[PDB]
């Protein structure tokens, strides 16, 4: 059963084992059951923590239903893979990734008064060879000020930094003037769409190149895992993979009554159904009731 | 697909481009006289203008029946297509069994025959471990949990450095 | 038995989702009571 905060996260979700939890709840409200009152409680810390642990119950089955585009040629299987993660994060309640990491910067550094503190409280979320490349620019601009640069914007010393911080961002490859003119808007919507269509060709070149960099790491992890495995004899592999299957059944068979472990062994029995159903008719595949 | 679509017998395909399907439709102003033939079978019915519009009323919603998951199959398919590239260079190995005769035995230096009989025993080591295709399913499960924990991010599943850098210049170069 | 379903077969099997749920059922009631009993 659900606690109604799960079933509100599973309404716009699309995966299987959540939508059969929604369809079983939507059939119960139809049969004369009353809907629970949604609690207007658990102030800002518990409210943003339940969002962390309810969106991860939408992301986690959703990531497993997204086929990686490994060993593929072209940019369209990466634009498929990234768009499946865009539409997955939207079903889990996330916003656009540009909107969601810019929210992460202003959350970490609401009280950062110096530019060296905003470069060290948003350190985990910026590429480290870009964060370091903004420290040679911060140390160069610190020479002509000889005082700490403040996070003001109206300060002239911040404009001396942002004259050379923008100089890195174009050299990194990202058009900072098309980013900044997108999030500022424009007056007329005709020239607001000339910057919208140049932000979204950066952004589509942005979300692809790190969806592709996520694939090329899985391609290089699977090729180093396989080439470590092709060097073994076949008898070593058969007993190494039989102990790992035994110790991980045993970890789920010791934990009894837990929800995850009794759902784990229903997956082992459903894997064995797939092998048993293919073994009965292998030119057609598994048998679906249809 | 959306709830309302706007396609059917208007700029439709009237002729097939293959030979295994020969399709010809007769575009009446109201209806369409279709005739499709595939080998020995012939089907010639009639569809209306409003009968193609009700087709997209209920959606098919094709979904994949995978053994473990769709993610896991995409890693195992890559390991299978990697295990084929290594099988292809075990296919170009020279036939050592054409030199198993005793007229190659007794002509050869005895240490260069131990090396040759161990180079043949190494091929059967390499060939029996690259055709162990039942081992590739449990290899793809060593790639899944590190990948799925990267997608279980606190920012976004689809976030990476290039988006987060370009959203840092929007954050930094605006006034705090 | 045989010939199960489609919506039973579409679920990805060994995803976590119930470790995340088991943590969220043991973290949330154990931290809802922490915020209502907190003085420095």
């Amino acid at each position: 059963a659900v606690s109604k905060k799960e079933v509100l996260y599973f309404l716009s979700s699309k995966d299987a084992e959540s939508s059969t939890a929604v369809k079983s709840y939507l059939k119960s409200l139809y049969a004369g059951a009353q809907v629970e009152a949604t609690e207007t409680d658990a102030s800002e810390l518990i409210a943003q923590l339940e969002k962390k642990y309810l969106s991860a119950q939408v992301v986690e089955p959703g990531v497993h239903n997204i086929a990686l585009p490994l060993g593929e040629s072209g940019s369209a299987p990466v634009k498929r893979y990234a768009a499946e993660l865009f539409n997955l994060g939207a079903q889990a309640g996330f916003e656009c990734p540009f909107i969601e990491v810019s929210k992460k910067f202003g959350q970490e550094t609401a009280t950062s008064e110096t530019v060296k503190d905003v470069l060290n409280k948003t350190k985990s979320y910026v590429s480290a060879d870009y964060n370091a490349a903004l420290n040679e620019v911060l140390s160069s601009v610190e020479a002509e000020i000889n005082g700490p640069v403040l996070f003001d914007g109206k300060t002239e010393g911040f404009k001396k930094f942002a004259a050379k911080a923008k100089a890195v961002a174009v050299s990194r490859g990202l058009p900072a003037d098309t980013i900044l003119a997108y999030c500022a808007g424009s007056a007329n919507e005709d020239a607001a769409d000339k910057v919208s269509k140049e932000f979204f060709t950066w952004f589509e070149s942005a979300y692809t190149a790190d969806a592709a960099a996520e694939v090329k790491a899985i391609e290089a992890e699977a090729a180093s895992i396989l080439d470590r495995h092709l060097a073994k004899p076949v008898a070593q592999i058969r007993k190494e993979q039989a102990s790992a299957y035994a110790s991980l059944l045993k970890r789920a068979e010791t934990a009894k009554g837990a929800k995850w472990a009794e759902k784990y062994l229903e997956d082992v029995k459903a894997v064995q159904w797939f092998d048993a159903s293919v073994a009965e008719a292998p030119a057609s595949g598994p048998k679906v009731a249809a | 697909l959306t709830t309302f679509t706007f396609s059917g017998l208007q700029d439709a395909p009237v002729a097939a481009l293959s030979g295994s399907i020969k399709l010809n439709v007769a575009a009446k102003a109201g209806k369409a006289e279709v005739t499709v033939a595939a080998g020995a079978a012939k089907a010639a019915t009639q569809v209306s203008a409003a009968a193609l519009r009700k087709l997209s009323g209920s959606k098919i919603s094709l979904a994949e029946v995978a053994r473990i998951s769709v993610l896991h199959s995409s890693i195992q398919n890559y390991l299978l297509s990697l295990s084929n590239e290594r099988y292809q260079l075990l296919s170009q190995w020279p036939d050592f069994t054409t030199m198993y005769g005793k007229d190659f035995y007794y002509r050869a230096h005895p240490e260069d025959l131990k090396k040759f009989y161990d180079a043949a025993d190494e091929y059967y080591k390499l060939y029996e471990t690259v055709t162990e295709f039942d081992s590739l399913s449990a290899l793809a499960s060593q790639v899944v949990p590190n990948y799925a924990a990267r997608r279980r991010s606190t920012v976004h599943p689809a976030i990476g450095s290039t988006v987060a850098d370009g959203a840092f210049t929007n954050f930094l170069l605006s006034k705090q | 038995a045989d010939a199960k379903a489609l919506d039973e077969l579409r679920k990805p099997k060994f995803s976590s989702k119930y470790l995340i749920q088991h943590v969220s059922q043991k973290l949330i009631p154990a931290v809802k009571e922490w915020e209502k009993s907190y003085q420095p």
């Binding site: 962390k52 991860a56 990491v101 985990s124 979320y125 910026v126 590429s127 480290a128 960099a213 996520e214 090329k216 790491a217 899985i218 290089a220 992890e221 090729a223 180093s224 080439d227 470590r228 092709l230 060097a231 299957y245 991980l248 059944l249 970890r251 995850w260 784990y264 997956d267 894997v271 | 473990i68 590239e85 290594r86 260079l89 075990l90 390499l126 399913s137 449990a138 499960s141 060593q142 899944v144 949990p145 799925a148 924990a149 990267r150 997608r151 279980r152 991010s153 606190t154 920012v155 976030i159 990476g160 450095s161 987060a164 | 060994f14 976590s16 119930y18 470790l19 995340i20 088991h22 943590v23």
Partner: peptide, 30 residues
């Protein structure tokens, strides 16, 4: 075929650490 379940989150946004190419394609050619 089955993997250990993890319930943990990624706090950082990092590059995905492309591993090094193994030597197996040329040592099997040796």
């Amino acid at each position: 075929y089955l993997a250990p379940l993890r319930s943990d989150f990624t706090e950082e946004i990092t590059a995905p650490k492309v591993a090094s190419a193994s030597n197996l394609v040329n040592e099997w050619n040796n």
